[PDB]
Amino acid sequence: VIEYSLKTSNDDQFIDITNLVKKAVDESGVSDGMAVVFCPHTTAGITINENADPDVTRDILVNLDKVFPKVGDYKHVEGNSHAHIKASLMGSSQQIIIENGKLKLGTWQGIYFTEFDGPRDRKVFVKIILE
Amino acid sequence: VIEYSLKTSNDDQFIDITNLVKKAVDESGVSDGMAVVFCPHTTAGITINENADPDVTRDILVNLDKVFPKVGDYKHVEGNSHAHIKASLMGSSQQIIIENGKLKLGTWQGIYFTEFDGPRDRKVFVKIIL
Amino acid sequence: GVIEYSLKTSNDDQFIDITNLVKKAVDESGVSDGMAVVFCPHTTAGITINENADPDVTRDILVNLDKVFPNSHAHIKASLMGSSQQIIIENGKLKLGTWQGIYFTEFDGPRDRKVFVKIIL
């Protein structure tokens, strides 16, 4: 497994890391298998969604924020309980099928690191499962 | 990897593809392994839930709609951002353990393709790992 | 094969830390590098990975999920958490973040539950 380093900027943002997953796939030399993307953070996660217009990621973030605001019924008064919730909603990992040395995903389907508590120095693990 | 073509009807509906997955496993001959079901769309997803009482899936779709309505604070011009959100919530894939040549599912569990922007020409990928 | 654990849940909603049960399955498998798949065979419960230190974080997730979705409520919450989660096995150890715990998320207890743990490759 290889560990990539990520530098997030805004409090919450979607970072397209599809390039990072493909980098791991080439480096592995695997033609067929599985690519597992894991996020070791509890205030961030991984999701797969539209890679085209950034209006889609904006809508997801804004609306996730609307339903689970920064301020509210949170005994975890540290202020990022909302990020913990959203992290679980997106998921701690996502997997993509590897076919003919390529990630088998939709045309405009990209892999995102979903930051709900930036700016921070993050990590993302990528494991390529051969054959 | 096996690919199944699906033609969805309603703009939002849960399509039970458990048997489709089961057929992939049986035809693969694999006895012990892992079945990975992947949805290559950004306005649809894959989930596992109640396979008996149709009221359950109905309530999920309805509740998802109430919390994330078709019209609202959305900049995306296609007017389908509510679908993109629900897709990430259900997830782009799910996996099921294969034991003794059969899907190790709970008595009430069914695998669903969750369409949030139909009717459209969809696909589902099923990868059997051993 | 698969290692099945039984869990006896109590309160209506509860996050049960099963990180050790999973590590247990890992150590017993003998594998050094692979994948640990944790699967919940119930439609009113799920599996998620989140803060394993502060009890209020799980309390906030449960209560706020409840606020937005006040037993079909258990069914929708089960799908939001997910029916399964995957963890990288490296050096015969779960490659988890410092504050990451694996949780079985009960939304309709008290019940006799089960979690399956399959170690791959």
Contact B67, A67 (CB under 8 A): yes
Which residue's entry shows tokens 């991984």?
Answer: A46
Whether B128 and chain C come into contact, CB under 8 Å, resolves to no
Experimental method of this PDB entry: X-ray
CA–CA gap between residue B47 and residue B36 (Å, rounded): 12
Contact C57, C91 (CB under 8 A): no
Domain holding A24: CATH number?
2.60.120.460
Please give the distance of CA A116 from its chain centroid, rounded to a whole number.
11
Query: Which range of residues forms the domain containing residue A119?
Result: 1-131
Whether C2 and chain A come into contact, CB under 8 Å, resolves to no
* Half-sphere exposure in the Cβ direction for A40 (13 Å, CA): 18
Contact (CB<8Å) B77/A67? no
Whether B72 and chain C come into contact, CB under 8 Å, resolves to no
Looking at beta carbons, which residues of chain B come within 8 Å of C2? Answer: 97, 99, 104
Contact (CB<8Å) B97/C2? yes
Resolution in angstrom units: 2.0
- CB contact burial B64-91 (16+ within 10 A = b; e otherwise): beebbeeeeebebeeebbbbbbbbbbbb
Residue type for A112, please?
A: Y
Looking at beta carbons, which residues of chain C come within 8 Å of B45? Answer: none
Number of domains in chain C: 1
Written as six digits, the tokens of C40 are 């919940």
Contact (CB<8Å) A81/C87? no
Looking at beta carbons, which residues of chain A come within 8 Å of C97? Answer: 39-42
Whether B4 and chain A come into contact, CB under 8 Å, resolves to no
CA–CA gap between residue C100 and residue C96 (Å, rounded): 6
Whether B42 and chain A come into contact, CB under 8 Å, resolves to yes
Contact (CB<8Å) A63/B42? no
DSSP string, chain C: --EEEEEE--SSSEEEE-HHHHHHHHHHH--SSEEEEEE---TTEEEEEEESS-HHHHHHHHHHHHHH---HHHHHHHHHH-SEEEEEE-SSSB---TTEEEEEEESS-S-EEEEEEEEE-
Whether A72 and chain C come into contact, CB under 8 Å, resolves to yes
Whether A88 and chain C come into contact, CB under 8 Å, resolves to yes
Contact (CB<8Å) A76/C68? no
CA–CA gap between residue C101 and residue B129 (Å, rounded): 27
* Half-sphere exposure in the Cβ direction for B4 (13 Å, CA): 21
Whether B80 and chain C come into contact, CB under 8 Å, resolves to no
Taking only residues 16 to 35 of chain C, the set having a beta carbon closer than 8 angstroms to any beta carbon of chain B reads none
CA–CA gap between residue B104 and residue A70 (Å, rounded): 39
B and C: number of Cβ contacts within 8 A? 68
Written as six digits, the tokens of C3 are 């290692």
Query: Please, which chains are in contact with C (at least 3 CB pairs closer than 8 A)?
Result: A, B
CA distance C89 to chain B (A): 16
